Amino acid sequence: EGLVEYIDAEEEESILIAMQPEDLEPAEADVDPAKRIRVSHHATTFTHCEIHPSMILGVAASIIPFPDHNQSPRNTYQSAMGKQAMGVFLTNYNVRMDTMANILYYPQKPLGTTRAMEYLKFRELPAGQNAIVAIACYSGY
Amino acid sequence: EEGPQVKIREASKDNVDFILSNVDLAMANSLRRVMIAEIPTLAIDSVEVETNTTVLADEFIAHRLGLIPLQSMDIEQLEYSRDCFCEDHCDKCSVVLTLQAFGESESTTNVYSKDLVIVSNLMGRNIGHPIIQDKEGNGVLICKLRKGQELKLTCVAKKGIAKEHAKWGPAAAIEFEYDPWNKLKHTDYWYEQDSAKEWPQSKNCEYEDPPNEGDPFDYKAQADTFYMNVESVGSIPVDQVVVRGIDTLQKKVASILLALTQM
Amino acid sequence: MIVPVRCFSCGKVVGDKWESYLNLLQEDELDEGTALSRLGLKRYCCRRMILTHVDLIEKFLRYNP
Amino acid sequence: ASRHGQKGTIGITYRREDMPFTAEGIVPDLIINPHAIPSRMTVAHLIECLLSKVAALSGNEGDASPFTDITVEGISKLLREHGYQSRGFEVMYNGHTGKKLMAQIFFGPTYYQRLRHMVDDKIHARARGPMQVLTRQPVEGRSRDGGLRFGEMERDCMIAHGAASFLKERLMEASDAFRVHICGICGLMTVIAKLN
Amino acid sequence: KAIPKDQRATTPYMTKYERARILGTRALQISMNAPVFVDLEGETDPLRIAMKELAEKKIPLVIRRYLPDGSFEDWSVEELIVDL
Amino acid sequence: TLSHLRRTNTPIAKPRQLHNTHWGLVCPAETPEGQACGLVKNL
Amino acid sequence: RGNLMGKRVDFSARTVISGDPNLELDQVGVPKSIAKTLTYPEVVTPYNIDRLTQLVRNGPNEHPGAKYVIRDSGDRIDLRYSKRAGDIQLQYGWKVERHIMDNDPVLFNRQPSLHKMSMMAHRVKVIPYSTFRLNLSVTSPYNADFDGDEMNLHVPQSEETRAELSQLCAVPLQIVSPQSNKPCMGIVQDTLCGIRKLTLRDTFIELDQVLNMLYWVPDWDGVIPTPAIIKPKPLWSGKQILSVAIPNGIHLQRFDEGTTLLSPKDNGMLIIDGQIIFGVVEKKTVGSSNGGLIHVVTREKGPQVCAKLFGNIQKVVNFWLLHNGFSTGIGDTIADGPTMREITETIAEAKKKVLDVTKEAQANLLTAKHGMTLRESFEDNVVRFLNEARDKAGRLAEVNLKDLNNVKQMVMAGSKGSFINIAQMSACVGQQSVEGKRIAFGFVDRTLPHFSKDDYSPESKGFVENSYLRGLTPQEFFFHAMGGREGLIDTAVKTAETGYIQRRLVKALEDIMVHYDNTTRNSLGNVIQFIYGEDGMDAAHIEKQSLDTIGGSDAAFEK
Amino acid sequence: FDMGGYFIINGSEKVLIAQERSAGNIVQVFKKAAPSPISHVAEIRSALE
Amino acid sequence: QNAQRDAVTLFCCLLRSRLATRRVLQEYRLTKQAFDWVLSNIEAQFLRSVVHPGEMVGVLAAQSIGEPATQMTLKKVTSGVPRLKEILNVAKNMKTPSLTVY
Amino acid sequence: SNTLFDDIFQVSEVDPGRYNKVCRIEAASTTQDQCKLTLDINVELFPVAAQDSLTVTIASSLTRSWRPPQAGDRSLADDYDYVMYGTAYKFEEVSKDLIAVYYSFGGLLMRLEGNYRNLNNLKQENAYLLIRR
Amino acid sequence: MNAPDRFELFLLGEGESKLKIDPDTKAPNAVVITFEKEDHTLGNLIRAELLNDRKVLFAAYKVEHPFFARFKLRIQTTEGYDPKDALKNACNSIINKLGALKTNFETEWNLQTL
Amino acid sequence: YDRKVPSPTGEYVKEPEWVLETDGVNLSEVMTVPGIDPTRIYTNSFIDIMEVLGIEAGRAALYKEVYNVIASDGSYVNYRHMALLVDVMTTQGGLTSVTRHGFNRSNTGALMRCSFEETVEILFEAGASAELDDCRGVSENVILGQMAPIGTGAFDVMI
RNA sequence: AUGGAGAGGAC
Ligand SMILES: [Mg+2]
Ligand SMILES: [Zn+2]
Ligand SMILES: [Zn+2]
Ligand SMILES: [Zn+2]
What we know:
The structure is cut from a larger assembly and holds 12 protein chains of 7 kinds. Chain E is of the alpha+beta class. Helix content of chain E is about 30%, strand content about 10%. Chain E has helices spanning about 15-30, 45-55; strands spanning about 60-65, 70-75. In chain E, a hairpin with a 5-residue loop joins strand 1 and strand 2. The longest helix of chain E has 16 residues, at about 15-30. Chain E is elongated and about 45 Å long. Chain J is built from no helices and 9 strands. Chain J has strands at about 5-15, 25-30, 35-40, 55-60, 80-85, 85-95, 100-105, 110-115, 130. In chain J, strands 5-9-4-1-2-3-8-7-6 form a 9-stranded antiparallel beta sheet, with no helix packed on it. Chain K has a single domain, classed as 2-Layer Sandwich (Gyrase A, domain 2), CATH 3.30.1360.10. The interface between D and G is large, with 80 and 86 residues. The complex binds magnesium ion and zinc ion (3 copies). One zinc ion binds near residues 84, 86, 89, 90 and 93 of chain B. Chain G binds one RNA strand through loops. Chain G: This is DNA-directed RNA polymerase II subunit RPB1. Chain G: Belongs to the RNA polymerase beta' chain family. Chain G: It is found in: Nucleus. Chain J: Belongs to the eukaryotic RPB8 RNA polymerase subunit family.
């Protein structure tokens, strides 16, 4: 029905993309001091609009909560490390016979999530638990 | 009576909420750890499996059985296996319970600590009955079995101490709090603009007088008066937690007194 | 992979509260926070024990053998 | 590891008693060091922990989606309605002692993952074992029960210290010491030592 | 040749590598119950002995220092100053 | 598994660098460290 | 290279490593399982025979024990099997291969092994659990931490080889290293944080806790020092008790910025004999630094007593801290109301200034800085306007964090963090850059396809106007991701080039030693230096001192 | 939850890994060195697939 | 004997300036018995500070330049590791050749 | 055992220089024109207003480890409001006719300046400064 | 795998005695009692108590490494009062407060509802 | 550039000067220019310094540049080490780099050079030139499994 | 056993 289009890097070169459906194009207008600073519309000669900025990340990074408040290299380090996090790898582990299978006893859908986790089935097949954790100098161990 | 003082503000089957006047901070705390970790209890500490054609793995189930709160009231007349002169276990030092469940129904069949069955000889003691606080009278969900599945095992519950495994804690959480408006400056509060408006007042601020800007700091003050609340998990009724708590602390303070004499 | 027989951190029995928590959610419509409260799951550590829980065993039973 | 590149391994385990405790009886499953926070600017961690706490109390599901109008201030108001101090902190008590902690501690649920890389799969030790045939040196690998390389770089270290008998011993009585017979004329190992 | 006892050029002091090696060497002799030359005062450790034997100048070994060219001077452990 | 099924490899002037045109096709964060950094990419 | 210059070897072990506030400096915690495998031959001798026959009775798998007794013939009685593990008379002269034990010297190592300090002799302490354990202060020469690093351990097999270790290689005798003529180990993290905490002029300790701390230092003479305060209630001062850890005749004096023998800011440092007179104790003193405590104590009282010093300073500080506590939260990334509005209006006056230049440069009234493009001048001016923006906005946020601010308390102690860490967490993260320039046009004339062509303005080109606290936007995210990948690459690439530089330097200097004539030579007896280092000295025994014949008026010199 | 996309070869599950190359049949110009004679080059990889 | 007087110059320069008469008596009023110690020390402490023949002083230099080269990572000149790759390579065409004129 | 200096002072400056327990205090003797004092007081134990007027003394007296006290049962040598135990670390001629001594009471510092003073303050291990009222 | 059994926290080993009493060499009339199989639960409670006894010049305890359930009490007393008595008394005192704390709690409890 | 220099009265004072900085190097000819101080001129190219003002000033400037790398980076390595390297490059007579080109040329025993870079070609014409080997090289004794003449091994022990 | 590949740990 021509509401969505597929664009490769070469055609991406010829179009102007809005980043957020609403915000980025109703007409023309106070604020919240907590909210990160944005820019605007400017240039209003769009051809296309982002489906959703959080879609620029792939699978492993899609797990990181608030990645947009982390120094990049960390988001990378957690990407290497999310892949080596025990939990249920498939529901049928009892009937497989793999060399090496690690299954976490009591998996737990994380308390802070990501809209993208939805499509990654992270909440159904989690790998990690929710430890009540404390930042403190204690015994020094 | 004479020394250290108790006032109970609230009391249930599961929670005693008290105030403890006229005591050292050392005693008030030491009592709290004893309650957490040194009052003896009964828990499954050995499971012999005979079938488990269940979705869950043998030692995983064994593990859950350990955590299941078993009646430990008359516990002081059960012995420690390690002490008792039998080989392995006996009726003097262990309660044995049995489990069988087979899924018969199309609908998923459950297995509850209700379904556990004392089989050794209790001989009068009030011990080993799995605790059930559940509304429909089936406490804890050991596991589920589908139509064909079967689980057939045998537990030996033994006398144990939270120090050795947290399964033996009569425990649950123990709230603890003194000097509710820092009249002792035992903390120093973190603030952005206002200590007082940003930290919230504890419930126990109805029980003490506020300090008045118009005053200078009381440097003689010591911590008295400690607002506790002990929650029991059931293997012992709350009153007994705090009493066996005090009983044990005294017991192992005693052995020190005794040991001076021996040596 | 079945309700924890016991909240980790603190020790409260939360094993018997699963069944019932499902009923508060679905059968009389309540919302998770409310449903948790009625179970006496008051301090937030035993309060995550249940809300974060995932019952994989309901998937595990699906396999025949 | 939390979910923000804060790896770290265990150093000790303390029981509930010895652990520091919230006034309501709560005790942590886990203590990380505040020194892991400032150099690594890993603020998501700090937010997920605070977000995570309201979710738990409120029974909702904290949304930490990337580009959203969810805000450390707005989480803090929510946490404040829940009766707790709006920035994470809670007064806590040392467990050895019952005495208040002077400082207040940032306390909260935070998703933590357990990684492969547990010690009893790394732990290895060898006091002589099996050798390769070609070099008559030790075999490689813990799975084969082998020795560890004394690398050129470690050889330099011993040279620098000036520990010569040790650099010798490491390269003879460990590893591949061997006795041969030389001709005092031509100088090769040509000799046919019909020893004995 | 050799190189004469008057006109030795090198430190009268004992280098740390000399020490280490003397103590090492005596501890190796002692460990094999070759005879012990001082008053072992409880001290049962072969190396901890050699240290006491050295602090008492009763170690009868001699140090042959090679100069780069092949010359060399002998000093006795008896005569070297042990500061350090 | 999910990650591994969606991987990229590049053999052998500035290839490891995250290039503007990666926007929205390749993940800006998920790549390995060392060795393979910027050459192994994830969709 | 891989078989002669470097062999795989016997008597070795590897595991995970973790830290231990209660090991001595020069100790190494060795798992009882590893302890049980690695061996040392001991000759049988009237001095050890009772301990040795006894270790054989234990046999090969009950800790202090042994496997293998070796005979006259030199045959191999194997104590795990062998019908006569139970018998066994021990003729003088048979070796017994006993387990490793407490105070055996072993050689400890973390790779890559970049300096002599990367392999050191520790004293074994056999302990439960499967990690090795070291003091935190032996952390840096190893360049270790406990996020999963692993370390090796090599056990010496002869009497002289353990001699060589405890006499040449021992951790104490490495504290002050020739590399930089300074200590290479100091007080770090918790201890360094809390020692500054302990010494504030506000930090007073009262009796109970004073006698506990006092008891914790084991060299303690059993003499309570007289409290600074007696008056209404005997208080002691943080400074006071910590001074129990510090030896006698240790003199040290400093002077920082304010400092004036009244140190109105508790600045600097004065330690008149083993007692600290004035000043907050932090990194400049107790860190691994040039003029500091650890330098002085080592030189002044001997490595032994200094090695022991680390121990004492931690046992006390670590204790005091366990009972003070300390922590960080998002609390300390929040700058003020008012401070936020300034940060925003600073940033904006930089945005509105880069505009003016871009306006002017386009209009053709910008002049070239001598010898460079018009366009080069523009970029240079813009990156300065935006770097100073980020600094001014940072420094503005640093001024508003209180003394009770945890991030700010770590900075002061010197335990972690720095201005830029504060800057980027609270104020503004700043300009993303790749290859020395701000973000390029990857597409024709734009940077992402959400911009129009030919747009050089802050945001378009990589300015992350936001803080980590407030959070990066989509564009900003990607950009900051670009800049980070550059750093990840040439961190992976740095270690490769350096790993080589090194190998060459070493292989090229390999055989240069100092011969018995103080001449510096090599395998050819070729002269490199006539007197080593020009002065004949060893770099460990050298300290910065001022030659004050050299400055000042001709008048004040004669005076 | 298994997603497919892989093969199974002698029991073992394999994933083919996407391989990156330059496009063929595309014309690119490249400035070249300065210790060089050939100063610009326009080049084309000619693919038929 | 000249190499010896050379080697020791810079240290004496210091010694002579610290142990000069006005100063000994005036700044830090030493007594005869204390002074004789202050000498006795200096000579011992000095002797202790001589480098020990045996010191593989080569390896020690490579590592001492090598190691901090490894803590190097990031407007004119080529600096850091790439500069150090050049210096040790006696690179014929360095990336930033430059004159400094006075 | 004995007194080593006495005088009455009038406070002229309180300073909570970013502390909440200590205060650098400035004062002048109400007798001697050639005389000032600066001192670190624990203002949370013995609170001090400006324009206060404190009696100040140095004893040396009424070392064996500090036995916990029983003082109106012992010899309190005080009946003063506020009493510290410090060390002397420098003796500085402001020249003339003008001598100042420096004291550290575990880091709470004090600098006193006068002239006849000297003839009584030895270079010593000493000094319990006492205050009252 | 290298973990020590948990019971070694509270059972005594091969001829471990419960207390060891040693003459402290540093100062006179002072003793260092080692308590095998205890921790803060006890060592803090005795320290705190020894400090109310006014013929006690010094009392402090310390758990030297936490892998191990063992602490040390160092005690010093006024000449004429042997250290052990100082502890002996200190223990009974504790027991009596606890004996009181017990009955005082009961009579309170026997008065409640729910 | 700022500059410290003795004052008319003794005290070192800040007395700043105008300095000139170049893209590119021609030392041979810029020093011969009128108007400047040919006594104090510098290039980072130490390879020209060596050509123009000879080997000793080359050494001095090769160090100046090595030092400047460590220092620019914040760090400080003691002078004796950087001197030793610099002196080792500098004693053959010209600049002798740290590669198979530089140091690994120099008639030091064959086994020693063979342990770096060009293993076999070194050992080949070591066979065809029929070389003798000292065996004083640390790394030859590594190979032979003997005690290196290295601290501890630098002398001998006797009776 | 040998020989090769790939993933991954620490800087
Ligand atoms: Mg690491
Ligand atoms: Zn029995
Ligand atoms: Zn809980
Ligand atoms: Zn022959």
